[PDB]
Amino acid sequence: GSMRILMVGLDAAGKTTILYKLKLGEIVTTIPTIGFNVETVEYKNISFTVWDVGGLDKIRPLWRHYFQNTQGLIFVVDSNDRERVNEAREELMRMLAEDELRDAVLLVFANKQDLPNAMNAAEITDKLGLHSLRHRNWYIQATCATSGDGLYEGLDWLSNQLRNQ
Amino acid sequence: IFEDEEKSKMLARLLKSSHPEDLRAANKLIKEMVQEDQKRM
Ligand SMILES: Nc1nc2c(ncn2[C@@H]2O[C@H](COP(=O)(O)OP(=O)(O)OP(=O)(O)O)[C@@H](O)[C@H]2O)c(=O)[nH]1
Numbered sequence: 494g495s496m497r498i499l500m501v502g503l504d505a506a507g508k509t510t511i512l513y514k515l516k517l518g519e520i521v522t523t524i525p526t527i528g529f530n531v532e533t534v535e536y537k538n539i540s541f542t543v544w545d546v547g548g549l550d551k552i553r554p555l556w557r558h559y560f561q562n563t564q565g566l567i568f569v570v571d572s573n574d575r576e577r578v579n580e581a582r583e584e585l586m587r588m589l590a591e592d593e594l595r596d597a598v599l600l601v602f603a604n605k606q607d608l609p610n611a612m613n614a615a616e617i618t619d620k621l622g623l624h625s626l627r628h629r630n631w632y633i634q635a636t637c638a639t640s641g642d643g644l645y646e647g648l649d650w651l652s653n654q655l656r657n658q
Numbered sequence: 659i660f661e662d663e664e665k666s667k668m669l670a671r672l673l674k675s676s677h678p679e680d681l682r683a684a685n686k687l688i689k690e691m692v693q694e695d696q697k698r699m
Pocket residue numbers: 502503504505506507508509510511523524525526527546547548549604605606607608636637638639
């Protein structure tokens with residue numbers, strides 16, 4: 494089986510870090526992504542093609558070019574960035590309004606849980622207003638890219654969504 | 659940066675293509691456009 498995943502979120506959220514932790518099993522250095530990275534991750538007999546798309550504000554208008562055929566969205570949030578959590582919500586809701594993503598499922602990663610004052614998954618749920626989403630299957634998972642904690646639990650959820658049609 | 663509708667159409671078709679060369683082209687196109695915009699500052 495296959496699943497096309499679009500992974501977006503504000504710049505510095507940790508997307509590229511997550512992509513290569515999944516693909517290569519390690520934390521590698523990154524630079525802010527101008528454009529995208531794409532890798533296929535084989536997991537539970539599913540080939541997940543994951544599109545890691547840059548989140549600097551200057552290139553957010555490009556996110557729309559990646560919506561077509563997307564089956565799962567991974568929206569990555571810096572759990573320690575209280576100053577920009579609402580900005581993340583604004584981008585998330587703006588993207589969810591799009592018809593091309595009507596049938597996409599949503600996995601939110603509350604990332605950087607290793608940081609001393611990181612907001613937990615429940616707080617991020619509240620701040621993003623996820624409970625208000627309609628006609629959408631969604632899940633939130635706390636993650637730490639370094640240890641890898643939460644990453645495969647996220648893929649497990651996506652996998653179960655695909656399996657149940 | 660991306661106001662030119664025609665360049666946007668080129669970018670959109672490359673990003674939605676199944677051909678690996680098109681995807682490489684798109685990725686470079688985005689960097690060029692950003693870099694050119696960085697110029698002209
Ligand atoms: N403390 C901590 N830092 C992280 C974690 N994940 C990523 N980072 C750091 O956050 C910074 C941004 O990470 P990136 O992976 O480049 O972020 P991105 O989301 O790809 O950013 P854009 O390419 O601009 O969209 C880097 O310095 C990473 O080292 C994490 O789980 N914990």
